[PDB]
Structure formats: structure tokens, C-alpha cells
Symmetry: D2
Subunit: 288 residues, 4 copies
Amino acid sequence: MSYQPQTEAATSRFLNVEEAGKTLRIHFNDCGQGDETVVLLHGSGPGATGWANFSRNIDPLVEAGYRVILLDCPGWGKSDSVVNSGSRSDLNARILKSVVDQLDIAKIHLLGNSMGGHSSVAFTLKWPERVGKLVLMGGGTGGMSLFTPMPTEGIKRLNQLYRQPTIENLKLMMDIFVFDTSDLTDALFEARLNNMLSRRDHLENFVKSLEANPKQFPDFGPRLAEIKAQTLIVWGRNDRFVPMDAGLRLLSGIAGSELHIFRDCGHWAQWEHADAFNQLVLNFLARP
Amino acid sequence: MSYQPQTEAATSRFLNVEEAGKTLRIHFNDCGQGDETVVLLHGSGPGATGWANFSRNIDPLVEAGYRVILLDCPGWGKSDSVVNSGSRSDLNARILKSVVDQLDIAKIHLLGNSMGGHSSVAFTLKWPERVGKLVLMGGGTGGMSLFTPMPTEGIKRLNQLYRQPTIENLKLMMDIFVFDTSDLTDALFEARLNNMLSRRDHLENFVKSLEANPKQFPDFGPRLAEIKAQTLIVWGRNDRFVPMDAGLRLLSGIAGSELHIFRDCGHWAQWEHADAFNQLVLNFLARP
Amino acid sequence: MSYQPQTEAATSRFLNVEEAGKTLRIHFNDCGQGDETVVLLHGSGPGATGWANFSRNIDPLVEAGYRVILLDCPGWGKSDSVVNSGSRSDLNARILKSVVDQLDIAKIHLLGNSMGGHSSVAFTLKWPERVGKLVLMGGGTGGMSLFTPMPTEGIKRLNQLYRQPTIENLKLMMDIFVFDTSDLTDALFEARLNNMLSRRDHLENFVKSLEANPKQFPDFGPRLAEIKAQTLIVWGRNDRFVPMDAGLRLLSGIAGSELHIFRDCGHWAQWEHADAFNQLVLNFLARP
Amino acid sequence: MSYQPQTEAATSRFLNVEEAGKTLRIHFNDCGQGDETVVLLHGSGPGATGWANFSRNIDPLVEAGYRVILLDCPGWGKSDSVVNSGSRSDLNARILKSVVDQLDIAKIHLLGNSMGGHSSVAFTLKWPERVGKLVLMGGGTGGMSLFTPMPTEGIKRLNQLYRQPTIENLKLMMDIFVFDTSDLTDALFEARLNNMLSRRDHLENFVKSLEANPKQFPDFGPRLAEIKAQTLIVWGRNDRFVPMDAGLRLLSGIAGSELHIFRDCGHWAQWEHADAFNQLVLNFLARP
């Protein structure tokens, strides 16, 4: 019996949680019947959806027997809009702890991209006994780069996109965002544009929160030694939103870290080399 | 009496050089009559002229008594336009050899910028007898950076400006060019744009030369150990046109090097901190 | 129904080559009857037979069905002793071309470590047709390091060992190689010691070749872009013999390279991590 | 008249401090009578003293006319011995604050070396109003180096020297310090040897402090943005005790920071290039 493809509408559920004395409804997607579960977090992209980001990766995890949970972070997608001057990673970790408490599983595996990856690290710090295995891509710590000047051009273009939504500006930020532009298709363009224009509240909330607090990802350097679980970091050399050197710092921090670099890969690696990344992550998960 | 600021009109001089069996006219300026002599090169910018680049540096060098020669390479300023299919740096070196032979000066100090710095290094490789000192600002080696993606954004903006020169792309390039825009004034803009609109043959020649061969600057790494003269490097950290790592490479090669870096700096370093740069260079030159 | 591992005595083979009007006897090992042929190059450690370095990795490859040719370059083991004024790279490349020509195999996949890796690159340069896939382990490019002083202490202790051959020097050498010295056993110490004691002539030839040329491994920087085959690079972070940053430089040159770095690994990567390295190499080879 | 070179005996002073409910006696040297004050802090070498490290630099500073004070940290020189399981940097900050409060000078400029440099950073955080100008040499921040394995060569030999005292290891240490040992003279050898043999208590206290607490110096990364005064960092390229990259990290921390690197210079930088370092420091201090 060959595994049938999944659809975002089919797997959609919602849960309301009480945090900081306020209610918040979070959308999430659960698939698979396997005992072992894997958590996925989306990036910080405009109108980015958890199902949208991981369109290629959802399958090999489900044929391998892993039950997969995709978490739509608050302030993105179908989750309720929120304004926060505080750290995004801390809030994301709190929300994830709440949702896993409702789901009632103790040990989980984390795979987070960009902002979520940041939050992922945060989680492992302040409830370490929960996480089993850790994978990062294009993030893990927000700090000044050593050689490549900050702010990078990708961040400036993304802020330009938030301040004024425009399809041509979206085309620009996609083109800089991904190294190999040939694979880009108009279907993704229109879907992303529709999603981002539909939710104006998230965009204005992000702008206001950025104005409120200049920094959203604090430095986590001195505490990196605290992590004990095995970790793997994947990165792209031609990534322009965040420089390579940041990943190297993480390679120093964690005792068992192993880094994997592609020669010509953009920020959004899982799309560039889906097969290699999927096989590597599956082998890492199967590694005893 | 204080040394009067120099005027290009009074100090203008022209010379004839036979390169590749072709007659060419070269423009330059000479100031001072002291025994010690120095040559000043110019950058690779649109319509860049040595006088515009070195307005602040030109006075103290004359004040110290050094004879100064500001040299304009072909393809810029009043020199004859030319289309290149090989290595630009060697061609500049040959022209500089011809002009110094006509001046018949034995000992000479070289201070090159960006592509001009390239030329200087190439020159020093062939004729170590003639060169006494080297001061390199923002260039001197052609190679792929360790941690910064290529092609970098700055050269991309420069190329698109050459593709069609206009006021708004000039504003954008100037904004990215220098770290601070407060002290910037419109007089520099008007002078640069009038020098641009004066000649279009230079711009079209540059474009056809670039499209003829993708690389016009060779890699001098393996032989860079041949230089015996003491040298100094000044570099900019936040510079986006050429990454800092490449500069570090130069440091490793030469026996007597000294690297100097400013944090709040761009490509065009000498203008941003004129006092510190002049003090450092004069101290290095007077050093026995 | 796995076949028991083969012995050196059964797999020993001898070929004769002529170079520069001299007769050289080359001793190597050949195993497996598969169509695909993989050449294994020995390390630069004193008294290091090719079989010693790759004892663990032979079995999985031959079990997968790959034909393996483990080569001993001149100057080690049972091969004839030589003194070379030129580089080791081109010399080993020529010898390997000669031996494969006697073996008349159309295509090979190269696995190189330390010295061999260097030569491996040289091979791919000047006979591109024979090589299709390239794997490097902690070496393969000459040239001095940007961030690490030279001579690095590993090379210093290696030369000291060549000058004073003794057991305690071998102990210290093993101390710097492997991150954790616990895994080593006395059997390896005695085997390496008696092996290196058997052939002093190799020692005198190597040392007087060292006085022949201070630098024996040329840098391939400018030519690095000429390689067209896909490549995998494995490296160690705690490596002291060859600095980590050099590996990054290789990533720049190759068209589609992949860099893999382990957190706690020395010069001798294959021995320390067995399952992960074997699986990675097998997947990379099988992957088109 | 020529200003007389200073003598240790005439300028020696002893003052008292309270720390952790204990009375400590500290030895320092005072020179000059200028209103402006500069404080010099010594290194971490065994038996090293404030006067020894700055012997070549002390004279030009008083020649300019600035008042200068050489400080001996607890556990070094004639100061009372102490054991610290906690951080050293804060302890030196407290001692310097107390001594300057007794000497009651409002504005002070700091020059630090190795461990002292680290302490200097701490001071600028605690009492930013007092520090006017800041210069560092080879240190200032803890944490794992990105490109170099730890513990490195020099720190390991240093631990060896503290564990067991002798003269041959003293030659080895001087060999690791200096680029060229020909300049150094055995008079310094015997001075250092008698100094370190005279006081076994300091050696024992250092050993116990290291064995009690692994990390002596913390990382000050996240708060580096708090410093506002101008800084000058001087470093040596072949440094073996602490790699180059750390300096670059400080180059990111301070907004107005300035970096200077010598191509061929050991850890004990100021002795190796007396004239250049003195001239640079006088230029930096005189600059308004």
C-alpha cells in the first residue's frame, strides 16, 4: 500500500491555550500514526505557512514511520495575530510546551528553520529533558557576523516587503532569497502573495513589534555548553540573509555537533536538495 | 608661507605611450620638487579620477615635501579609451613603466586603490628594483572569498549602473559606497555626474571589455611571496564591494606587512578618516 | 554469506614502472571482482602502509561489490625508495596513471588522505577523463593557512620523529592525531614501530628530499576552478596537522562540493568514526 | 636636561585593600606628575611583573608627560598571595577601583595585556564614567576560538610550567613567546627564573585556583555593545596562546574600534616592536 499524499486542509486542527493571562488559538497539522514524533517549525517569511515550507519533506518522514507535527507559530498563518516586544523564541517555546502538554507526549524531535530554529534552541535550554534529537538550518543564534556586514541585504529586502506589500517586490525578494531561480514557479508566487495580502494584521503587528524592540533573537553564546543532546546543523554557503560564520559558532557550542555545507545552496536548503537533505536527516534519526 | 592647495589645471601634464603598437595619450599631475617621489593610482568607479579620490590626501604629502604624481589609467578621465581582452593590471603596469621611464626616476613609492592596487602589486612583482614601499587600500588580490558570497552585491550594482548610467542609480551606488551620508554633499554628486556625461566611450568600452572576458584581474597568490619591500595595508570592515577576508590573505604573504582596519568604514577609506589615514601613512613613510 | 576479510599476503601484487630513466617496483593490494574500481591512497605518516590506514573501511566497500586497489606510493612500505626534487603530487599522479594503464581500467573513483589527497587533486587536473568522483579526507590542497601559524606543531613533531626514531615519539604523535587516545592499543604501536624500523632508507630519502625543497606540495588555487567532477570533503575540527580553514578554501574551488565537518576529530578521520563515514561514502558513491 | 630613567626602588609603593572581608597588600609603581593618568596592567606569565613587561614602553610615556602607574595583580610580584575560585576579571576590577579611589583620579586610560586586558574590559562595564581611553593587547574576551583547537600550545605549556617549575621549560616558553629568540638575552632568563623561584606560594595558589575552577575568564560577548569610549586593539599574527579570531570579535563589539595587526610578532608584542607600538599609542592618546 503506497503512501497517499497529504493535504494541508485535511490535516488542519486548532487549539486554544491560555498564556500570560490571555487566550490564543494556534493552528497545527498532525499526520501519521507512528509512536515517535517529529516537530516542524516554519521560517519568518511573509505569509509563510508550515505546510508550505515543508512541502517536499513531509513524505519521507511519514513513510519512515515517524508521526509528524507541523506547528504554525503565533503571529503567522492561521494562528491568531499577536504583538510582542519580548523575545520571539521564548514565546514560541512556551507555546510549543503548551501544545505538547495538550498532546501529552514527553520526548520529541525538533527540526526548525530560521526563526523557529532559534526558538528550537531556546526550547532545549529551558526544558532540556524533553528533546531527543536536534536539527538546525540557517539559524540557532542571533548575533553579529564576523566577516559579512550586518544588516545583510536579504533582511533589508524583507523589511521592505513588510512595510509595503507588492508582487514585484516579492519577486525581488524571492530571486535574492533562492540561489537557483529556475526552479521557482508562478504557482508559489501567487499562493504566497494571496496568503500575505489576506492577513494584513500579521504584517502590521510584525512591523509594530520590530519597532518596539530592535532585537528579536538574543545572543545565546555563553549557554551553548549546557546542551547535551546530539545535534546536526545544515547550512548553505551562498545564503545571503544570514552569513555562514554564524553556523560555525554553533559548531563550537554543542559537544556532538556535525555540520554539513552545500556549495551552491540558498537560505531555503530543503527545496534546493530535497533528496540529499531528506536522506541525511532520515539516517540521522535512524542513527542509534 | 603655507603650501597652496594644488590645481589640476596648472599641474596638468600629458604623455605619449606606445602600447601594443598603438599610440595612446595619458593624463597625469605632478606636484613638488623633492628628491623622494610617490605615485597615486585611482579606483575602478564610474568616471573615477585620482583628483576626486585623493582631494584630502593631496595636501599633506606636498607639505611633507614628497614629490607626488597622480596617475590616470586609460579608460578613465582624459586618457584615451581602450578595450581590453586580457589582464587589465599588467596593461596598467606596462603604461606605468613607460611613464616612469620617461620620467626616469629610480626609487618610487606606490599607493594604489582597488583595481589600481592590483596594478601596484603586479608592478612590484616584475621590477622589485624600482619600488621602495607599498601602501594598499581596499584591494590588491583577485580571488574568491572564504565566507562572503560571490558575486558580491556591490559589483553587481556597479555593473548595472554601467549598463545604464543615471542619477538615481548613482544615488543608490553612492549610498551603498560610503558608510556615512551626513557629511556627503551635492557638489561631489554634480562633479561625478558631469564627468560621467562628458564621455560615454569609456562606459561602453568598459562594458564590452567586461562582457568579452568575465575576469580581468588575475590571481597573484602563489607568487606573492616574491615581494621583498616593506608594505602597509589599510582596509574597511563594513565594505561590501570587496570582503575583508581577501585583505587578510595579503597579510599572510609579505614578510613585513602590517594590517590596519577601521570598523565604521566602507570601500573608500581614505576620505572617511582623512586625519588618521594621513597620520598613519606619513608615519609609515618616514619610518627608516 | 559475507566473505571473510582478505589478507595482505594473498592480495599482494607487484608492478614495474620506469620514470626518468629509473626502474621502480610498486607494491600494492587488489581486492574484489566488481566492475567499479576505487583507488585508495596512503597517508603521509612515517611507516604507514596503505592497509594500515584503511583497515576498517575495506570490508564494507568490497562487500558492496566494489573492486578496490590500495596503492603504496614510492617511499613507503615495500615500494622502492626514491628521492624527488619535484612535487609529490605530479610524481604520484604519474605513477598511478602508469599502474592503472597496466591494469587497463577505464574509470576510477579516488579516495585520498593527506599526501595522496594532494596528488589526487593533481591527477584530476591533467587526466580529467579517468576520474569521475572525488573524495578527500583532511587534505588535497597546498598553500599556507590564513588563521593558523605555520609550521603547525603536528608537522614539527613529525619532522622531529623523522630525526629521532623512537617509541615515545610515536606515543606523542598518536597523542596529537586522535582526539581520544583510549581507543588505541599496544598492537598498533608495535606494528607501526617495527614497520618504520624495517626500512630506514625511506627515512633518509624523505629527509634529504626535504632539504631538496622546503615546500613539497604546491598550491592549486588559480587552477582550482578547472575541476568538473563532483566532490565530497571530510574534515576534522580539532585537527592540528592541517588547519580547518584550508578545507573551506577547497569548498570555494569545486563546482559542486560538499563539506562535512565533525566536532571532535583529528587528522585520522576514517578510523575514529567508522559507521558514519562508511555510510556517507557509500551513499555518495551510489548517488548519481 | 634629559629626563632621568626611572628606578623600581624609588617608585615602589604599597597600599592596602579590603576584599571579601580580608586585608590585602598591593605593590605598584608610580611615575610622572601629569594631571592625566594611565594605568598599566601586567600579563599572566609565571613570575612576570608589571615593570618587566613594560620596560621598553615606560620611558616614552613619561617623556610625553603623562602620569603612569604600573599595577601588580594579586598573586604576582610582591603583592599578597590569594586563591580565586571565582572569576579573576572582577577581582582585578575591584582591586583597581580601590587603588584608584585611594589615589583619587577622576579620569584614567587603561592599557592591558593578556589576562589584564580581560580585566580591563570588566572595569569599563562597571564604572564607564572613569575610563577615558582604552587599549588592548592580545585578549579581552573568553570563549572557544572558532578556527583553532583548545587548549592551545601556549596555555598547555603554561599549565605544565605551573605544575612543575624548571629552567628548560622556561627556555621552551620564551621560544614560544617570541618570533625570533636571537634578540632575547639570558639576563631576562635569569631574572624571570629567580623571580618565579623566589615565590612558590603564587605557583601553588595558581595551580589550586585552576584545579578548583576550570574556566577562569568568562565571556563578555552580549554586553560588548555597552562600551562607548574609543578603543585600540593591537595583536600579533603568529600568536599561539590565543588565536587571532578573538581580536576580530572585539572589532565587532566596540562601535569605534580600531584594529592593528603585525605580520611577524609573538604574544609579547610590545617588546618586539618598541618604536612602532610606542608611536601608535602616543598618536592614539593624543588624538582628541
